[PDB]
């Protein structure tokens, strides 16, 4: 029974105690549906926490840390039960053990605890987990231990409400700079997911990432053979290019667009979608960045995805086309007109999603305004593909801005 297990776990006979702790561990580590609540209610937590102190018996420490790791792998309530037992300070002490397995199990437990939430993460941070954790990174470390370390780093970087403290980001970025040159796929995926979480927390963290000097080694991963590495790298660089024009220009100066012909033609629709999202954030920039997209010969593929892509990729493609008008010259919009953007761009006006219809109407109106000399021919083009009927039906729409823009467009460029 569990009662006997706890009582024996409190025994002064080392054999009885170790056997009890091992029985608990086995109860918590044999199946994917362990009995965590039963063990918590039994009162075993403080006993395991005490066992964490037994530096004389590395096996007892390892077994107790294993049990606590598996209790902390459940719901937030069970992880917080482990936290309330004062386990985190003793795990942080164990991080300095001379025994590799004990260190690794402490890292594992701390990773499960940090991943619960940002306040738990910040409690573990305030106690100084980051320096010991990152001190494990080395060539001599076993690859599985290093993967656990990188998983803990990822958990440290997730949650952006609040985001990790600035000092912690400054400590973690050099470790990521080191790890982004690793060959193991799992370490690369963890490193790049950590970078994606860090770059999704505002422009200041993006500038920190840029200053670390890691982007030149992040952009090449867009062409990695493993699709997980590609997805993570694309997320990270997309986040970066959601920033200012200068950060986007850093990304571009890393030769990023050269990687996108393979991303736009990728068989995975989600990769096409993320790539078109990146490109839409590129087209929302200055004239030279729009011209870089044009020179990379990516516009035809963007229009093809607008025409024949899944709805998400079509959303991002519509956003890219409409962003090009923000700062694009009339020459650069004429290039779009020559590439037959009007028909597939207008075919989106019937989608139920109101945001897409609004974006497409905005883009059409801006296109008609820019090309004053060719306004009539572009209106004829819009009418040949059945876009005029769509725009006129949109006069009966629910949203206010939608029918407002519809009436404005019809009056200005379809009456005259």
């Amino acid at each position: 029974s569990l009662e006997a297990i706890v009582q024996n776990a409190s025994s002064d006979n080392q054999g009885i105690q170790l056997s009890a702790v091992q029985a608990a561990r086995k109860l918590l580590s044999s199946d994917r549906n362990p009995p965590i609540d039963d063990l918590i209610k039994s009162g075993i937590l403080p006993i395991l926490v005490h066992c964490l102190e037994r530096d004389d018996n590395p096996s007892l420490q390892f077994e107790a840390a294993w049990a606590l790791t598996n209790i902390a792998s459940g719901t937030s309530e069970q992880t917080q039960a482990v936290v309330q037992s004062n386990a985190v300070p003793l795990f942080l002490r164990l991080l300095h053990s001379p025994h590799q397995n004990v260190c690794e199990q402490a890292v594992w437990a701390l990773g499960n605890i940090i991943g619960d939430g940002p306040q738990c993460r910040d409690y573990v941070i305030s106690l100084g987990v980051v320096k010991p954790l990152l001190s494990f990174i080395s060539p001599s470390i076993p690859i599985t231990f290093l993967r656990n370390v990188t998983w803990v780093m990822v958990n440290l970087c997730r949650h952006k409400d609040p985001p990790p403290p600035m000092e912690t980001i400054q400590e973690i970025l050099p470790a990521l700079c080191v790890l982004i040159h690793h060959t193991d796929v799992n370490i690369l995926v963890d490193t790049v997911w950590a970078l994606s979480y860090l770059t999704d927390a505002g422009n200041e963290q993006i500038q920190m990432v840029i200053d670390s000097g890691i982007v030149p080694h992040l952009v090449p991963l867009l062409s990695h053979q493993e699709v997980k590495v590609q997805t993570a790298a694309l997320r990270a660089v997309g986040n970066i290019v959601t920033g200012t024009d200068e950060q986007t220009q850093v990304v571009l100066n890393c030769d990023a667009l050269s990687h996108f012909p393979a991303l736009l033609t990728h068989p995975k629709e989600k990769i096409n979608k993320e790539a078109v999202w990146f490109l839409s954030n590129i087209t929302a920039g200055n004239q030279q960045q729009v011209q870089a997209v044009i020179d990379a010969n990516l516009v035809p593929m963007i229009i093809h995805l607008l025409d024949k892509g899944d709805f998400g990729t079509q959303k991002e493609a519509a956003w890219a086309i409409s962003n090009l008008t923000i700062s694009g010259r009339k020459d650069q919009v004429a290039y779009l007109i020559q590439q037959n953007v009007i028909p597939p761009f207008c075919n989106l006006l019937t989608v139920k999603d109101a945001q897409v219809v609004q974006v497409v109407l905005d883009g059409l109106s801006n296109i008609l305004k820019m090309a004053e000399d060719e306004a009539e021919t572009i209106g004829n083009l819009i009418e040949e593909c059945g876009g005029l009927e769509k725009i006129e039906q949109l006069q009966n729409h629910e949203n206010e801005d939608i029918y407002k823009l519809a009436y404005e467009i019809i009056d200005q460029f379809f009456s005259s």
Partner: peptide
């Protein structure tokens, strides 16, 4: 986010 250590 969370990992259970299953006896390998």
């Amino acid at each position: 986010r969370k990992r259970q250590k299953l006896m390998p």
